Design a protein around this ligand. Structure first.
Ligand SMILES: COc1ccc(-n2nc3c(c2NC(=O)C2(c4ccc(Cl)cc4)CCCC2)CS(=O)(=O)C3)cc1
Ligand SMILES: COc1ccc(-n2nc3c(c2NC(=O)C2(c4ccc(Cl)cc4)CCCC2)CS(=O)(=O)C3)cc1
Lengths: 482, 470
């Protein structure tokens, strides 16, 4: 069989059941990622997401080099490109990891009709989530669970997630090794950021290096007996927690560089080694289960990112404030805690969930009363660990539109990091301000601002809203809705 | 048998007994909608209704493609088109859902005359209503019931509505699949808004996506919510779909019933569970034999009230430029989206009729017929007579808005020029100080119209004129 394995997510060779199906009885397997580099014709995607993807494809290709093979990066769009690929490569089989997200399910349904007409066999495996999501939905009566509680109860009734699949054999991959022509880097090679026109000048190393290899090293470090004390047995918020952890796994779960089933059972085995008990609580896998919740709710709701027409979403008359939204998006709100977080997210592609709470609150029910839909757009451009289902679900959750209390954009920062070094790291123009005034620089005496070489209104923007006044208005609005 | 199933309402494949009749024993079945493109010869229909209709026809075509058939959209008028179509297709049978409304019933009678002359069998089914309206009328002495209590009394003595018929077989549709020429889209395609002369620049997604698929999806999400109040359009709202026939009323009826049996042990629900469906039914029952149902003069059930003729005021009410932000936002939302809340209809209808302007309900009927998605002849005309106290026997245009939405964000959503005003003045911007208006960047009388009438004066005078009627 002539098999093409299609990489989209599942950017990994481990726990790749779709890759296994391509290799089983294959004279030739070609591993493909179809990349559209025409950025102006799509919604904006930040350099961090692109750099991460490119580093994930470089790792896939490096790893396929060890198997006497290569990664084929075909530049274009999958619907336009596949028909020529089926004919040029004599493709008899196409395999890819299932995409439950509705727009991805729509694209993949079109690709499958095109392959059936071509006579290409299609095989899919759902190694992106712990469970079969449709199974979860059948058991809830063919509707998706609408609360986290009900979702937990449905999976409490189900079998354990499938164990991670064995990786493809080196011998097996030699058997189906594709003929690699010497012009491969020029046609099918993994592009650099510079080739794609990105500003690579003076660009630091990525805080979140992409790729399966990085994810696997991070998994091992994350699941060391020492670290389990820090992040599992006794979780506590440090100002160091705001900064990116070398053991964080969330970007790699999003891109598929780390199998969620592999994480799930490796974490389970750590639990068995730390506590002789073999039965962990579901809260142990909380992040993975919230992930799985949002994928379950969104798989049949194509309006999942919208308010209007979205059956699960409360309809709320959000303010239209494009200039506030842009100031929020660019870290120019004048609230250093908010601006430091948005700066970090833009520069690095990850922020702490606490930092997401503060920043999503400031845009929505906390301050600006701007729709969560806008916040979804920005996080899609910048945030590395949340796709359609997790990003929209989290925003609706935070805004109280589907499925807490919003904190002070000044006070919450002072409580999380009283030093203000987080502020100084990401808003250097405020480095001169003392810790008492760095979260309220508009309240520092002019003598303090002159000493800091930072004049509020000129060097750093004054606060764009009065939090006392906006929260009063917003709290009464929330009392009406509820 | 060569069968033509005629879509008018009943824009759905589920609970479509007329389509089941066309398919059974048929060599060929053709699903037809007859669209008059000449818009200016008929009365005005807003873009939202046209959009909802095209999306419902598009859904029906998509539904039929999955059965290896197509929807024939035939341009013209049914009286002209059907003789030519019956001979060109060798039609042996015409089927459609019964239309109880008086004007459609006269049309359908004419079509059945031509069909009989051509030898074409006609079958009709009453799947737009829960009941046989004519049986309800029988039980009232062959006169329509004029109170909701009499209506409930009659239907509580009747049998239960017919359960929804099963959708048609995919295999059966193949046996009567019609020949589809490659020129089909050129002749029988579903037109687009652009092709019908509508401006579509800047047109976002419809707030109320048309079609059966949407309707069935909303119905499930509506029952799931009930198992587990705002002025904004609900993503589980069902009412546009019942008007267009995208959602079967009987399906809604019995699924709502089954929900009652699951939640409450009692398998005997109250009539109030179907209140909206029963108000729907009441008006269809009252209108079916009254050709003057939408007018005041010559309407036997309507109280003759000396309404004022004020066309300019009527025009400002329809365009939402009355100067009352509460009334104008509602009218803007109706014009923009195609649906407004029932208490918003109340406020807006009182303002035109007995509350302030004292314009006839018949004009409010005409405006709603252009803009409103969920009310056809019987329901829209009956609601206006009911509200105006003209048959079937008010709140402040500032206070009722302040009480309904103290935030005023509903005003700001649809009247963006008033966004600057604080909540204490956004329902009465004429009482806002001149500085406040300059800070809001909206000067009353220039950027936004002053209120066309004084409510204190007109409401006392109009309550006196209503008293003279009684
Ligand atoms: C507001 O914008 C966003 C905030 C968070 C995310 N996000 N990204 C990932 C995950 C989440 N969401 C969460 O964990 C929760 C959450 C929600 C809202 C907030 Cl504010 C914080 C947390 C969902 C309910 C409780 C925890 C889990 S993951 O692996 O599945 C990676 C995305 C966008
Ligand atoms: C004033 O213009 C209109 C107001 C309402 C409608 N309308 N549309 C539908 C329905 C109704 N009417 C009602 O239910 C009532 C009603 C009457 C007057 C008002 Cl103001 C509000 C409600 C009738 C008596 C009590 C409830 C039920 S339906 O499915 O049958 C869809 C149409 C036009």
């Amino acid at each position: 069989a002539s098999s093409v394995h299609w990489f989209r997510k599942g950017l990994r060779l481990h726990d790749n059941p779709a890759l296994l199906a391509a290799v089983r009885g294959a004279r030739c397997v070609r591993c493909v990622y179809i990349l559209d580099p025409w950025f102006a014709a799509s919604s904006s995607v930040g350099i961090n997401r692109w750099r991460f993807l490119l580093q994930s494809l470089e790792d896939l290709d490096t790893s396929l080099r060890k198997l006497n093979s290569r990664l084929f990066v075909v530049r274009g769009q999958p619907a336009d490109v596949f028909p020529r690929l089926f004919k040029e490569w004599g493709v008899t089989r196409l395999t890819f990891e299932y995409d439950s997200e509705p727009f991805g399910k729509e694209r993949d349904a079109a690709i499958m009709k095109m392959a059936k007409e071509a006579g290409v066999e299609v095989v899919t495996e759902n190694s992106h989530t712990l469970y079969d999501l449709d199974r979860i939905i059948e058991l809830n009566g063919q509707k998706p669970p609408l609360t986290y509680k009900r979702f937990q109860a449905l999976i409490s009734r189900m079998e354990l997630p499938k164990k991670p699949a064995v990786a493809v054999s080196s011998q097996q991959m030699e058997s189906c090794r594709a003929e690699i022509q010497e012009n491969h880097d020029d046609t099918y090679g993994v592009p650099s950021l510079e080739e794609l026109g990105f500003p690579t000048e003076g660009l630091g190393p990525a805080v979140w290096q992409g790729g399966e290899t990085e994810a696997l090293a991070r998994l091992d470090k994350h699941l060391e007996r020492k670290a389990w004390v820090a992040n599992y047995e006794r979780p506590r918020m440090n100002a160091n927690s705001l900064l990116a952890s070398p053991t964080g796994l969330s970007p790699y779960l999003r891109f598929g560089c780390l199998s969620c089933r592999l994480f799930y059972y490796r974490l389970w085995d750590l639990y068995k080694k730390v506590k002789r008990n073999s039965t962990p609580p579901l809260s142990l896998f909380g992040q993975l289960l919230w992930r799985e919740f949002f994928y379950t709710a969104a798989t049949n709701n194509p309006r999942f990112d919208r308010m209007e027409g979205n059956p699960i979403c409360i309809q709320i008359p959000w303010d239209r404030n494009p200039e506030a939204l842009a100031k929020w998006a660019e870290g120019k709100t004048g609230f250093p805690w908010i601006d430091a977080i948005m700066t970090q997210l833009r520069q690095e592609g990850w922020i702490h969930h606490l930092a997401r709470h503060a920043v999503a609150c400031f845009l929505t029910r906390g301050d600006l009363w701007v729709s969560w839909e806008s916040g979804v757009r920005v996080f899609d451009e910048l945030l590395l660990d949340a796709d359609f289902s997790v990003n929209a679900g989290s925003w609706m959750w935070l805004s109280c539109s589907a499925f807490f209390h919003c904190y002070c954009p000044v006070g919450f920062g002072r409580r999380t990091d009283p030093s203000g070094d987080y502020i100084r790291r990401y808003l250097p123009k405020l480095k001169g301000f003392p810790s008492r005034y760095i979260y309220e620089p508009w309240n520092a005496p002019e003598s303090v601002q002159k000493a800091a070489k930072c004049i509020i209104g000129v060097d750093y923007p004054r606060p764009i809203v009065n939090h006392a006044e906006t929260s009063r208005l917003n709290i009464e609005r929330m009392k009406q809705i509820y």
